[PDB]
A paper describes a structure:
The discovery of a gas channel in the ethane-capturing enzyme prompted us to investigate whether ANME-2 MCR possesses a similar access system for methane. Still, we performed krypton labelling on ANME-2c MCR crystals to verify the existence of an accessory tunnel via experimental means. Based on the anomalous signal of the dataset collected at the krypton K-edge, no signals were observed in the active site or tracking in a hydrophobic tunnel. Krypton atoms are rather positioned on the outer shell of the protein, trapped in hydrophobic pockets, as previously observed for the methanogenic enzyme from M. marburgensis. The absence of a dedicated gas tunnel connecting the active site to the solvent reinforces the proposed scenario that ethane-specialised homologues evolved this strategy by introducing loop extensions and dedicated PTMs. Labelling with gaseous krypton did not reveal any internal channels that would facilitate alkane diffusion to the active site, as observed in the ethane-specialised enzyme. Still, our structural insights showed that methane-oxidising MCRs do not contain gas tunnels that connect the solvent with the buried active site, in contrast to the ethane-activating enzyme. Our structural analysis suggests that methane first enters the catalytic site before the heterodisulfide closes the catalytic chamber.
Here, we obtained the true atomic resolution structure of their methane-capturing system (Methyl-Coenzyme M Reductase, MCR), circumventing the isolation barrier by exploiting microbial enrichments of freshwater nitrate-reducing ANME-2d grown in bioreactors, and marine ANME-2c in syntrophy with bacterial partners. Methane capture, the first reaction in AOM, has been proposed to be carried out by the Methyl-Coenzyme M Reductase (MCR). In the proposed mechanism, the heterodisulfide, made of Coenzyme M (HS-CoM) and Coenzyme B (CoB-SH), would react with methane to generate methyl-S-CoM and free CoB-SH through a radical mechanism catalysed by the Ni-containing tetrapyrrole cofactor F43019,20. Despite their physiological differences, these ANMEs have extremely conserved MCR structures, similar to homologs from methanogenic Methanosarcinales, rather than the phylogenetically distant MCR of ANME-1 isolated from Black Sea mats.
Residue numbers in the entry:
A (entry chain F): 2 to 265
B (entry chain D): 2 to 559
C (entry chain B), D (entry chain E): 2 to 434
E (entry chain A): 103 to 255
Write the structure that this text describes.
C-alpha cells in the first residue's frame, strides 16, 4: 500500500507538522472523563447521552450499499447529538495551528466535521465520538493549557499579546493560573462550573518553541523553509496552468514565464 | 523614484496608540476595565438610556453582552486614518455612524451617464431641428431646473423643495474642445483643467471622441427613499422634459419615446447592472459594480500619478468600505457588520508600509513602473517577498498583529500589498490577480491559518480561475466585480481587487482603467464627496465634520 | 371540428379544408422546426470581436482598458475559425450543425446541433457552445496564453459572468436570456419586433406568420391554450397569422387603396355577419342593432384578422410603424361600438394598445414599435394577438424610426435569409400538413 | 481514446471497455431520458389544494382570506380529476403522457408529454400545462363560477402572477423557475440536494450517479465541456458519478470499517501512482517527493472519485450530512500537501467546500447540506464535482437535520420511486451503451 | 417617507422552527425564561450592537432608536409570561368586534417576531437589507441566549 509523506519541509517545525498530521503526538497530561464533560458543557458528568434520533438498530436504515459497508461510529449507532469542541491557539508559538488541528482530526478520526478559522478551530462529531477526539487532542503535545484553551464563544486572543503570566487573553477568563497549574472553572461557553479542572502546567517558552507548528521570526523563520515555499509555488502554478487548459502542455503556455524553485 | 525609508510606515500609529510602549514586547498587563474605559462606549450607553426611556422599551445596553463581561476586557484602541493625522474611535468608522461613507455611496448610486448624440440625431431626423451651441445651452438650463424635481411644461405642478435637492445637477462633457468651450462653464466638466497631469486630458478626449455626454446626479434624498434603480429612470424623465422644452417639441409625440429609449437604455451608462434572483437588486447597487469602474471613480490618479501607490490605496479605501461595510456588511447581511474587516485596509498605515516596501523591492529588482514581465514567475516573486516581509512585520511588532487581530484582515492586507506591488510593477491587472492568490497560499502555510471559516472560497478557486477562459470562470479583472461568481459572498477581497486593478493602470501610467466616461464624471468637484482623497473624507465623517446631502431638517419639527 | 383553407403571402390558395389541429404548435412539423431554429441558431460578429480586441473596448459602452489590446484579425481567418467552431460543437457527422461565413468574413451563422438543446433544459446551449467554441478557436489560432485570453474571452462573451447576460459581447440570438422572462413560458415571447421584421425580410405577410407562430408557441408553453382555450388560441393563430381563408390578405387588398381603420372595421363586421359568425340579437328603440356571437372563438378570430388587416392598411398607407399602436386600439374600440360585442381578446388587444400608444409617445419608457416584444411589460397582455401586428408595422416602415431593424438587427437578416421556414413560412406550414 | 468499465451500485460489473463518449450527456440515451424526465414530470399536491380552498389559505405563509373559502374535496375525486388532466394535456393517444394517483388520492404524478417540451423553449410546460389542466378540472368538477374560480386558481398556482414563481402553490417540480438561474445554462444545476436524495431513495451510490449526471448535463449546457474540457468533464462524470472501474465503490468499501478522510487520500494517491496517472517528478532534500501528473484530466478524475469515497466514508461513519463540507475541503487540501499536485477541479472543490463549510455553520445564510444545489451561490463554483457528494451526504444522514429530505421532498420520493432511470441509474446508463 | 420606511424595514419571522432546532439538535429546553432572555438580547443586538465578540464597534444607539423587535402569539399563556414591553398585545389592540379572537385563531399557538430594522439602514441600502439584517441579529441572539457554540452547524 501507499506510504504517506504528509508534508514537505525539514525544520523541526515541519517535523512537528507531520507529527500532528500522522497522529504521532506525545501525551503530556491526563484529563478525567468527568472534568472534560464538565468543561465541554453539553451534559452533566455521568448523565446519559441525549439523542437527536433513535439508535440505528432500533429504527432500521434504508437499503443503501454505502450504509451496509461503512461502519457507523459508536456515537452514530447510538443516535447521539452532534456536539463540538472548539480550541483557540496563540500565535506566540502555541503547539497547534488551526489547519493542522483539522488535519489531525481528518486523518486520524472517523465521522468528524472539522473547521478551520484564524481564531478558533472546531471539531463537530457525535457527542461521545467528539469527546474521545477532544480528549486525545487536549491530553497531547498539541495542547499548552496557557497558549490554548476551549472556547466555544468569545474567542478573541490568538493574535494578542500574552498576559504577564503567559496566559492567552480570554475575555471570559475561563482559565487562570493557580499555583503553577492552569485551572478551568467555566465551561467552554463561559458558564461557571462547580468544579476546578486542573490542566497541569503551561509549557515553558523553550518547550513551546520546540513543540510548535508555527513559523515565525523568533523560532523557525518561514523565509528559510524553502521546501514549503516551493510546494506552495508548485501547487499554485499547476492550478493556474490547468485552469487555463487541463493538460501538461499548459505548463509552458505563454505567460508562465521562467518559473523556478529553490530545492527542485 | 520612491525609496522605502528606515522606519516602518506603521510605527507612527503604534506610538500614537501606545505612548511609551516598547514595541517589541510580546506581553501586556490586562486590567479588564470593561466599557467604562472608552468615551464612545460610555456615550453609546447614555444614548441607549435615552432611547429606552423615550420609547418605553429596552435597546442598547453594554451589559447584555454575554458571559457577564462588557466590551473592553482588553484595551479598546482607536484607529488612525492612513496618511491622515486623524485618530478616531472604531465606531466612528461604522458606515451607519459615518456620513462621509454614506455620501460616497449615495453619490455613486445617484449617478448615471447619458449620451446626447442619439437624442440630437433624433431631433434632426424626426423633427428636422438644428442642434447648435445655443440650443444646447438652453437645454442645459432646462435640465438643471427640472432634474431636481421642478416643472417646465405643465400648469399647476407641485415641486420638490429646492433646498432638499441641492445636490442634484447635470453637467455635460465632450472630447470636442470647440463645443466644450462654447457652453457656459458652470454646465461643463472641464477635462483639460481637471486632467492636467501626464497628458491625461488628451488620453481621455481621444478615448471619448467628439461625442457629447451628460453626467447626471439625481438627488440624494431620492435614492435614500428609494433605490439605485431610481437613478436612470429619474434622469431620463427630466432629460425628456428638457428636450421637449428646449426644442419646442409636442409635449408627448412619437419622437419623445425615442428620446426616452436613448436616455433609459441605448445611450445610458449605468454604474452597475442588475443581479440574479438570490441577491435580487436593482441596477446601480454595489453588487453590480465592476472593479474597473470602482477604480475609475477614485480621482487621486489625476492629482498625483507620479506616486501610483497613493492612488492605489485610495481605491482600496474606497472599495473596502463600500464592498465590505455597506454592501456585504449591510445589503447582504447587517447588524454590527464588518467595519474592521475594512478598516484594516485604510487605517494605521499598515497596508501602506507593506505596499511601499513592495514597490521599492520591485523598482530595484525589475525597474520602473509598469516594466516588469507580465508573467506568473514575476507574480510569484513579488507576492512571496511582499507577503513574507509583511508576515515578519506582524511577527516582529506584537501590537501590529494585535491591530489586525482577525486572520481575514491580515490575509487581505498581505495579499493586497502583494497584488498592488505586482500591478504597479507589471502594469497588468490579470498578473496581479495571480499574485493575490499566491499571497493567500504562502500566508496559510506560514501560520497554519488564513481567514474566517469561509474566507478562502474564492481563494482556493482563485489561482485556477485567473487564467481560465470558461464561460462563468474566465473574465478580465477590470470587468469582474462583486457578482463574479466566486466573489459574490465574502468580505476581505472586493475592495482590494478594485485597488490593484487601479494599481496596474497606475503602474502603466494610464489615465483610467476601464471607462473614460466614468473617469471624467467622477472628477467633477461639484459632487458632495471628494473622490480625489478618500481617506481624508472618511476622517471627516468619523470626526462629525462631513456634511452629507439628503437631510430633512427643512421639513421636520424640532 | 374546425377546418381552414391555407393561403400563401400573395393570396394564392395552398391547401383546402385543413384540420385546425394540423397547424397547432404541438403537431405541425414546420412550426416545431421554426421553434427549434430560433432556439439553436446564433450569429457571431467576428468584426465586433476583432474591433473589441484591437481597441481593448471589451464590454462596450465606451469602455477602454488601456494596454490590454490583443492584436488579432479573425475576420481575415473566418473560414478557418468557422471550421474549428463546427468541429468543436458538432456532435455527430452529418448532424444538423451548420457554421457559415457571411459578409466576407465579418459574421458567422451558427446553427448549433439540436442534440445540444435536447441535452439541456433551456435554449441557451446554442449561445454558450458557440461562445466557448469561438473563444477556444481564437486562443488556438492566435497562440494566446494565460493573461491575454481572458480579455479575448470578454470580447466574445461580453461582461459575462459579472452580468447575467453577454452584455457587450458578440454572440447574438433573436431570443434573450431566460432570466429576462417576465413569467412562466415567456422565452419565445421575448423576440424584439425589429428582429421579427428581419426574419421575414420585411415581407409583411410572412412577418405576421413568423411572429404569430412564435407568440402562440409561447402561449402554449405558458399553459394558456388548454381545453377550450386551445381552440381559442388556434383560431387566432390561423386567422391572424396564417392568413386562414385568405381573410387578412383580402381585407388588406380591398382596403389598400382608399381604406382606413374604420373601413376595415366595417368589412370585418360584414364578413362576420355574412359568414354567420354573428347575428342580430336585439334592436334598440333608436334602431341600433345589438349583435350576438354565434361562435365566440370564431368572432375573436375575425377580430384578430381585422386588427391585422387594419394594421397593414393604416401603417401601410403611412409607411410608418408608429400608427400600429392606435390602429390596434381604435379597430377594437370601434368594432365594439359598431356591434356591442367585445373586440379582440375581449379588450386585451385594445388595452395593450392603450399602454403601447402611451409608451411609444411619452417620456416614461418604451420607444418606437421596434423595441417591443411579447415579453415587454407594455405589450405582453394579449395572448399573441397584438405583437404580430407590431412586427408587421415595423416591417412596413419606410424609414421613420430611430432604432430601425437595420440598426439593431442587421445581422439577423443575413443569418436567416436562406432559412426556408423564414423565407416562406406559410408555404412551409401548409406543406407540413 | 478513453475507455471505462461500468459497475453498478453493488460493485458488480455491468459493461467492459466502454468508450467514454458513450456516457456523454450528448449521446447516452438514458442520460437524455433522465433530463427529459425531470423537465416534464411534476407532482400535484391535491391535499394541499383541498386544504387551501377549505381554509382560504391561498398563497401560504399564514395567509388567510376570510370569507373566500371554497369547499371542494379533490382528494376524494382524484381518479376523475386525474383522468381529466390527462385528457387535457395528452397530445396524441399513445404518447408518453402519464397521470397517476398517489397516496390514496393526496397527490398526482404528472408526466407531461415530451412534445409539449419540444414545442417550447424551456422546461416549464410540464408545470404550466398541469396547473392549467388542474384548474380547469376543478372548475368543471365543482361547477365553479366567475368569482370563486380565481381563488381556486391561486390554490393551484400560488401567488403567480404577482410573483414569478407559483409561490405557495401545489404544482411541484425538482427544477426551479428559469429566472432563478444564476447564469447561462444553470437550470439543471438548480436541484435541491434533498430532492436528489429522494430521487435516489437514499441509495447513496445511485444518488452520486443521479446528481453527477444532472450536474454535468448542466455543465454541458453552460458551454464548459467543449474541446479538451469535454474529456475533463466526462472523466469526472464517469469516475465520480458512474463508479467507473468500480473505484468509488471499492475505495469506500476499502475504507468503510476503520478509514477516514486521510486514509482515502492515501488510497487515491496510491492508485494514481500504481495506475501510471502520476509519477515521482523530483525529490526534495528532506526526502519529500514532488509528483507530476502524466494525464492531467485523469488525475482530476481520480481526485474526484476520492472526494466522493471520502464523503461516503466520513459522512457514512457519522451517519450525518454536515461533514460533507469539511470532507471536500480536507480531502483536497491534504492530497495537495501529500503530492504537490493540485486537487479536484484544481482548487474549486476545496474552495466550494470552504464557503460551504462557512455557510453551513454560520449566521449568514446557507443552511444544512440539503438546501444547497449546483445553482446555489455558495456551491456552484465547481463544474459538477462537489454537489454529487453533497447529495450523497444528505442521503446518508440518519436524522440529524432540521430540513430533512422527508420534510422538504416527500412528494419527490413518491413521484419518482417507480421511474426506472431513478431506481437504477447506473444500470440504465450502461444498458444504453 | 416614514410610512414607506416603516413598511420596508419590517420583516416577520417565526420562532417555532428555531425553537424546534434547539430542542432537536442541542437538546435545549425552551421556556418563558429563555425566551425572555432572548428578547432582551435581540433588542440590544438588532439596532447594531455586539453580544459575543470582543473589540466590536457598534451603531450609535441614537441613530437607530426606531429599531426594535417584539414577539406575538396566539398563545395567551405565553404572551402573558413575557415582559409586556417585548410583546404585541393582540387582545388590547383588537378589542372591538371580537377581532382579537379571529386573529388568535388564525395565528394559532405559534410564536412570531415583528422585526423593524433601522430606518437609516434601509435609507442607505434597500428593502432587501431587511430580512438579512433581521436574521443576522436573531442568530446572534439565539447563540447568546441558548449558550450555543458561536458558529456551529
Ligand atoms: C458568531 C460568529 C460566527 C458567525 O457567523 N459570525 C460571528 C459573529 C459575527 C458578529 C459578531 C457581533 C457580536 O459580537 O455580537 C458580526 C459583528 C456580524 C454581525 N452579526 O453583525 C461579525 N461576526 Ni465574526 N467578526 C470579525 C472577525 C471574526 C474573527 C475574530 C477572531 C478573533 O481573534 O477575534 C472570527 C473568525 C476567525 O477566527 O477568523 C469570527 C468569528 C465569528 N463571527 C463567530 C464568533 C466568534 C466568537 O465566538 O468570538 N469573527 C474578524 O476576524 C475581524 C472583523 C470582525 C467583524 C466585526 C468588524 O469587522 O468590525 C465581526 C463580524
Ligand atoms: C409631457 C407630457 C407627456 C409625458 O410623457 N408626460 C407629460 C409631462 C409629465 C411631467 C410634467 C412636469 C413639467 O411640467 O415639467 C410630470 C410631472 C412627470 C415628470 N417628469 O416629473 C407629469 N407629467 Ni403629465 N402629469 C399630470 C397630468 C397630466 C394630464 C394633465 C391634463 C390637464 O388638463 O392639465 C395630461 C394627460 C391627460 O390629458 O390626461 C398630461 C400630459 C403630459 N404629461 C404631457 C404634457 C402635457 C402638456 O403639454 O401640458 N399630464 C394629470 O392629469 C394630473 C397629474 C399630473 C402629474 C403631476 C402630479 O400628479 O402632481 C403630471 C406628471
Ligand atoms: C415600461 C418600462 O420601461 P422600459 O420600456 O423598460 O424603459 C418600465 N417603466 C414603467 O413602467 C414606468 C411606470 C411609471 C411612469 C408612468 C406612470 S403611468 C421600466 O422602467 O422598467
Ligand atoms: C449565501 C446567500 O444566502 P442564502 O443561502 O440565499 O440565505 C446570500 N448571503 C450572502 O452571501 C451573505 C454575504 C454577506 C455576509 C457574509 C460575508 S463573509 C444571500 O443572502 O443572498
Ligand atoms: O466564524 S465565521 O468564520 O463563521 C464568521 C466570521 S465573521
Ligand atoms: Cl495531460
Ligand atoms: Cl375546457
Ligand atoms: Cl360559442
Ligand atoms: Cl480544446
Ligand atoms: K434607499
Ligand atoms: Kr478540560
Ligand atoms: Kr486546554
Ligand atoms: Kr459614532
Ligand atoms: Kr401648484
Ligand atoms: Kr438622451
Ligand atoms: Kr454602483
Ligand atoms: Kr515598480
Ligand atoms: Kr496549512
Ligand atoms: Kr441572430
Ligand atoms: Kr416533483
Ligand atoms: Kr471597540
Ligand atoms: Mg516614476
Amino acid at each position: 500500500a501507499y506510504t504517506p509523506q504528509y508534508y514537505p519541509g525539514s525544520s523541526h517545525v515541519a517535523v512537528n507538522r507531520r507529527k500532528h498530521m500522522s497522529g504521532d503526538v506525545e501525551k503530556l497530561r491526563t484529563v478525567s472523563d468527568d472534568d472534560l464533560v464538565a468543561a465541554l458543557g453539553h451534559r452533566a458528568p455521568g448523565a446519559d447521552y441525549p439523542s437527536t434520533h433513535p439508535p440505528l438498530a432500533e429504527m432500521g436504515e434504508p437499503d443503501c450499499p454505502v450504509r451496509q459497508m461503512v461502519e457507523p461510529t459508536p456515537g452514530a449507532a447510538a443516535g447521539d447529538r452532534v456536539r463540538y469542541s472548539q480550541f483557540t491557539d496563540s500565535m506566540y508559538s502555541a503547539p497547534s495551528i488551526p489547519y493542522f488541528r483539522s488535519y489531525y482530526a481528518a486523518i486520524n478520526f472517523r465521522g468528524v466535521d472539522p473547521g478551520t478559522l484564524s481564531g478558533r478551530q472546531i471539531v463537530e462529531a457525535r457527542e461521545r465520538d467528539m469527546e474521545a477526539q477532544c480528549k486525545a487532542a487536549i491530553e497531547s503535545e498539541m495542547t499548552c493549557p496557557a497558549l490554548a484553551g476551549l472556547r466555544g464563544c468569545t474567542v478573541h486572543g490568538h493574535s494578542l499579546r500574552l498576559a504577564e503570566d503567559g496566559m492567552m487573553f480570554d475575555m471570559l477568563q475561563r482559565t487562570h493560573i493557580e499555583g503553577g497549574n492552569v485551572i478551568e472553572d467555566k465551561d467552554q461557553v463561559g458558564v461557571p462550573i462547580d468544579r476546578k479542572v486542573n490542566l497541569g502546567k503551561p509549557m515553558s517558552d523553550a518547550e513551546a518553541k520546540k513543540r510548535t507548528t508555527i513559523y515565525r521570526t523568533d523560532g523557525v523563520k518561514y523565509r528559510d523553509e524553502e521546501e514549503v515555499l516551493d510546494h506552495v509555488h508548485l501547487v499554485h502554478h499547476r492550478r493556474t496552468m490547468y485552469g487555463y487548459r487541463p493538460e501538461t502542455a499548459a505548463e509552458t503556455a505563454p505567460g508562465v514565464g521562467p518559473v523556478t524553485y529553490h530545492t527542485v | 523614484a520612491y525609496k522605502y525609508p528606515s522606519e516602518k510606515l506603521f510605527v507612527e500609529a503604534l506610538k500614537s496608540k501606545f505612548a511609551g510602549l516598547d514595541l517589541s514586547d510580546q506581553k501586556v498587563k490586562y486590567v479588564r476595565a470593561g466599557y467604562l474605559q472608552n468615551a464612545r462606549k460610555r456615550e453609546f450607553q447614555a444614548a441607549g438610556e435615552r432611547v429606552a426611556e423615550q420609547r418605553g422599551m429596552q435597546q442598547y445596553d453594554v451589559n447584555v453582552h454575554l458571559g457577564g463581561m462588557t466590551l473592553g476586557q482588553r484595551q479598546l484602541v482607536p484607529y488612525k486614518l492612513s496618511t491622515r493625522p486623524d485618530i478616531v474611535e472604531g465606531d466612528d468608522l461604522h458606515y451607519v455612524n459615518n456620513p462621509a461613507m454614506q455620501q460616497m455611496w449615495d453619490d455613486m448610486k445617484r449617478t448615471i451617464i447619458v449620451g446626447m448624440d442619439l437624442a440630437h440625431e433624433t431631433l434632426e431626423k424626426r423633427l428636422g431641428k438644428e442642434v447648435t451651441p445655443e440650443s444646447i445651452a438652453g437645454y442645459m438650463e432646462a435640465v438643471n431646473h427640472t432634474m431636481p424635481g421642478a416643472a417646465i411644461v405643465q400648469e399647476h405642478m407641485v415641486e420638490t423643495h429646492p433646498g432638499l435637492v441641492d445636490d442634484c445637477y447635470v453637467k455635460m462633457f465632450t472630447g470636442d474642445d470647440e463645443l466644450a468651450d462654447e457652453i457656459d462653464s458652470q454646465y461643463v466638466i472641464n477635462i483639460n483643467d481637471l486632467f492636467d497631469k501626464e497628458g491625461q486630458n488628451e488620453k481621455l478626449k481621444a478615448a471619448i471622441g467628439k461625442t457629447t455626454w451628460q453626467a447626471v446626479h439625481i438627488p440624494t434624498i431620492v435614492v435614500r427613499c428609494c433605490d439605485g434603480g431610481n437613478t436612470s429612470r429619474w434622469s431620463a424623465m427630466q432629460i425628456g422634459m428638457s428636450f421637449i422644452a428646449a426644442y419646442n417639441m409636442c409635449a408627448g409625440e412619437a419622437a419623445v419615446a425615442d428620446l426616452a429609449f436613448a436616455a433609459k437604455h441605448a445611450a445610458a451608462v449605468q454604474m452597475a447592472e442588475m443581479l440574479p434572483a438570490r441577491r435580487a437588486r436593482s441596477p446601480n447597487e454595489p453588487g453590480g459594480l465592476s472593479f474597473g469602474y470602482c477604480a475609475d471613480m477614485v480621482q487621486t490618479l489625476r492629482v498625483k500619478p507620479e506616486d501610483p501607490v497613493w492612488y492605489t490605496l485610495e481605491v482600496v479605501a474606497c472599495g473596502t468600505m463600500l464592498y465590505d461595510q455597506i454592501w456585504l456588511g449591510s445589503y447582504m447581511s447587517g447588524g454590527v457588520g464588518f467595519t474592521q474587516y475594512a478598516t484594516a485596509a485604510y487605517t494605521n498605515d499598515v497596508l501602506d508600509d507593506f505596499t511601499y516596501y513592495g514597490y521599492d523591492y520591485a523598482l530595484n529588482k525589475y525597474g520602473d513602473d509598469g516594466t516588469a514581465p507580465n508573467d506568473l514567475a514575476t507574480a510569484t516573486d513579488l507576492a512571496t517577498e511582499v507577503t513574507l516581509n509583511g508576515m515578519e512585520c506582524y511577527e516582529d511588532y506584537p501590537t501590529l498583529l494585535e491591530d489586525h487581530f482577525g486572520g481575514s484582515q491580515r490575509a487581505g492586507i498581505l495579499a493586497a500589498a502583494s497584488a498592488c506591488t505586482t500591478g504597479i510593477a507589471t502594469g497588468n491587472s490579470q498578473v496581479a490577480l495571480s499574485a493575490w492568490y499566491m499571497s493567500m497560499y504562502v500566508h496559510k502555510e506560514g501560520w497554519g491559518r488564513l481567514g474566517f471559516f469561509g474566507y478562502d472560497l474564492q481563494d482556493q478557486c482563485g489561482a485556477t480561475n485567473v487564467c481560465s477562459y470558461q464561460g462563468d470562470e474566465g473574465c478580465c479583472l477590470e470587468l469582474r466585480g462583486a457578482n463574479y461568481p466566486n466573489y459574490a459572498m465574502n468580505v476581505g477581497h472586493q475592495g482590494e481587487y478594485a485597488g490593484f486593478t487601479g494599481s496596474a493602470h497606475a503602474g502603466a501610467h494610464d489615465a483610467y482603467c476601464c471607462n473614460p466616461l466614468i473617469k471624467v464624471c467622477f472628477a467633477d468637484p461639484s459632487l458632495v464627496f471628494d473622490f480625489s482623497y478618500i481617506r481624508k473624507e472618511y476622517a471627516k465623517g468619523a470626526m462629525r465634520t462631513f456634511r452629507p446631502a439628503g437631510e430633512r431638517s427643512l421639513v421636520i419639527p424640532a | 371540428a374546425d377546418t381552414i383553407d391555407l393561403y400563401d403571402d400573395r393570396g394564392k390558395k395552398l391547401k383546402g379544408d385543413v384540420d385546425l389541429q394540423a397547424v397547432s404548435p404541438l403537431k405541425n412539423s414546420a412550426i416545431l422546426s421554426m421553434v427549434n431554429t430560433v432556439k439553436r441558431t446564433v450569429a457571431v460578429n467576428l468584426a465586433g470581436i476583432e474591433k473589441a480586441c484591437k481597441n481593448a473596448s471589451y464590454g462596450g459602452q465606451s469602455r477602454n482598458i488601456p494596454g490590454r489590446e490583443v492584436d488579432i484579425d479573425p475576420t481575415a481567418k473566418a473560414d478557418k475559425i468557422a471550421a474549428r467552431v463546427k468541429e468543436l460543437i458538432q456532435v455527430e457527422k452529418g448532424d444538423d450543425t451548420e457554421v457559415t461565413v457571411l459578409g466576407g468574413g465579418k459574421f458567422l451563422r451558427v446553427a448549433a446541433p439540436t442534440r445540444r438543446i435536447e441535452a439541456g433544459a433551456e435554449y441557451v446551449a446554442g449561445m454558450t457552445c458557440t461562445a466557448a467554441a469561438l473563444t477556444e478557436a481564437l486562443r488556438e489560432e492566435y497562440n494566446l496564453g494565460l493573461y491575454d485570453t481572458p480579455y479575448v474571452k470578454n470580447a466574445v462573451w461580453g461582461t459575462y459572468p459579472q452580468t447575467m447576460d453577454m452584455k457587450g459581447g458578440n454572440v447574438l440570438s433573436v431570443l434573450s436570456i431566460p432570466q429576462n422572462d417576465e413569467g412562466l413560458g415567456f422565452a419565445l415571447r421575448n423576440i424584439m419586433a425589429n428582429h421579427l421584421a428581419m426574419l421575414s425580410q420585411r415581407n409583411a405577410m410572412n412577418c405576421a406568420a413568423i411572429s404569430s407562430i412564435l407568440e402562440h408557441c409561447g402561449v402554449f408553453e405558458m399553459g394558456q391554450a388548454i381545453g377550450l382555450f386551445e381552440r381559442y388560441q388556434l383560431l387566432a393563430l390561423a386567422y391572424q397569422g396564417l392568413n386562414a381563408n385568405n381573410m387578412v390578405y383580402e381585407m388588406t387588398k380591398n382596403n389598400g387603396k382608399t381604406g382606413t381603420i374604420g373601413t376595415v372595421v366595417q368589412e370585418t363586421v360584414g364578413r362576420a355577419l355574412d359568414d354567420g359568425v354573428i347575428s342580430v340579437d336585439k334592436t334598440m328603440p333608436s334602431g341600433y342593432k345589438v349583435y350576438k356571437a354565434n361562435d365566440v372563438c370564431m368572432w375573436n378570430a375575425y377580430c384578430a384578422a381585422g386588427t391585422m388587416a387594419a394594421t397593414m392598411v393604416n401603417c401601410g398607407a403611412l409607411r410608418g410603424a408608429q400608427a400600429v399602436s392606435s390602429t390596434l386600439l381604435y379597430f377594437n374600440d370601434m368594432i365594439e361600438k359598431e356591434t356591442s360585442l367585445p373586440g379582440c381578446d375581449w379588450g386585451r388587444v385594445e388595452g395593450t394598445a392603450v399602454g403601447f400608444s402611451f409608451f411609444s409617445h411619452s417620456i416614461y419608457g418604451g420607444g418606437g414599435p421596434g423595441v417591443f416584444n411579447g415579453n415587454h411589460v407594455v405589450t405582453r397582455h394579449s395572448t399573441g394577438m397584438a405583437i404580430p401586428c407590431v412586427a408587421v408595422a415595423v416591417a412596413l416602415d419606410a424609414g421613420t424610426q430611430m432604432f430601425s431593424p437595420e440598426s439593431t438587427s442587421a445581422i439577423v437578416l443575413d443569418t436567416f435569409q436562406d432559412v426556408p421556414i423564414m423565407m416562406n413560412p406559410l408555404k412551409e406550414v401548409a406543406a407540413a400538413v
